[PDB]
Amino acid sequence: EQSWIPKIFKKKTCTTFIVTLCQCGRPRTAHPAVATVWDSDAHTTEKPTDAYGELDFTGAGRKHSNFLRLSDRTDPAAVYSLVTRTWGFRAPNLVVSVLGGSGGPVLQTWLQDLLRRGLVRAAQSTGAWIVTGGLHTGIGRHVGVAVRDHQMASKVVAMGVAPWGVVRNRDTLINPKGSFPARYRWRGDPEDGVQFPLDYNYSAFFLVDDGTHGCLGGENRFRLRLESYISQQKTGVGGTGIDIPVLLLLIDGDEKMLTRIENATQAQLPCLLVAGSGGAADCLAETLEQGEARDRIRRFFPKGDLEVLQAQVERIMTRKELLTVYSSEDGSEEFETIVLKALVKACGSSEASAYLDELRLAVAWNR
Amino acid sequence: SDLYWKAQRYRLIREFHSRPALAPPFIVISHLRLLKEAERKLLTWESVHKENFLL
Amino acid sequence: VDIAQSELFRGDIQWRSFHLEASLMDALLNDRPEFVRLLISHGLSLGHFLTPMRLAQLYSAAPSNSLIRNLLDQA
Ligand SMILES: Nc1ncnc2c1ncn2[C@@H]1O[C@H](COP(=O)(O)OP(=O)(O)OP(=O)(O)O)[C@@H](O)[C@H]1O
Ligand SMILES: [Ca+2]
Structure with a gap:
């Protein structure tokens, strides 16, 4: 049944060599015989997917974790249809994405509590999809801890997206013939910098391939594309x-x-901002509540005085209706009201046909 | 007194839980014959309820 | 304590674990439940904070000829 997947999806390869070190980010023994500023599409070769499968994490686990490798230049519809149809995931009544660097090995305790209490329980009640970095690092790791903790106190499906290059132990993933089972060395002892393992809390993984050995931001384009497509998608009964x-x-x-956020705001995707999150989050919250001064302090000094950030803020404020700020309210610990208030505000309509989804969530939550 | 009895009820049960099966007149033979991750899951479960209870 | 959160933790000033380590110790020795709650609430890495020397300090802080001191002396 999975034989369609390799044909439909392709794994990119650097192919062309661009300046020992290579601008393509894959310094190997020798780039292909066929092999300036390296480009994602100009200097890449698309080949059929060779890492699709269902990971089975070593030791404890559910023995069910879809792993797929795909090129960035791929239609979000295909992946969504595959996830909805092949893997059997139910149509999500809600999908919430988590973004942010989350600087530091660990986050603030209150913020973690808000995440696990608010986000996870809200998603569990409505069976929402939670999409984050598919890596046991930074924000994605914290979410996984929250999901794991909630699961122990019993499910919730939380898919993951991560660039293929940054993944660790990719050897067991690589299988052109397909790997219905697969053993992953998730307990990767060497914390070799960029290379990371895959958190086993997430139920599915999307390995964005761009012909690189590891880099950040490669999945942003695909990430936004998928969110926009889902935002423009209907649930159940077609x-x-x-x-x-x-x-x-x-x-x-x-x-x-x-x-x-600016790209997401341009995509008509409602956004919510948590007060006290930190750099790149507090600045926007203050603006909703000089701009160069905030960038100096709210944002890091590097480029803080740069007006590019200020210009983005102005554009961000230009569509401030779509987005909003979740005030911690000294640790409110509840945000279903905030989420509903955001969605209704983002709707900006009156036909009441576009408010059924918001109504259902209002019903699912006790609000 | 009611609370005290309820408490003593445990002491009774423990006493008979370990007693040899046979009766006193035949108890002699019994005397002669006499001569992890789940826990982590459980603890997490306890804490969640505590946290909910306090909130 | 309300003043400290209102003023010292109004958000206009950052903080560090080493900054709060001394204050935490004082609150524990002085039996300030509200403060210790507040300080821990401000993202303090307790595990990395506690030290056997500090732990000894706390026990040493027993009140005068307190019963605990008698037990510690006997120990
Ligand atoms: N993909 C992952 N990679 C590493 N750790 C993960 C991952 N997903 C979840 N974890 C959990 O994160 C923690 C990783 O740190 P670490 O293993 O040092 O902590 P631990 O729970 O005390 O266990 P250990 O005895 O293995 O040290 C463990 O709890 C591990 O279960
Ligand atoms: Ca709607």
């Missing part, structure tokens, strides 16, 4: 259902996060 709402949750970060 189109007879209702639109699937989507919300983006940002926690601290850097200019990359600021770029992501």
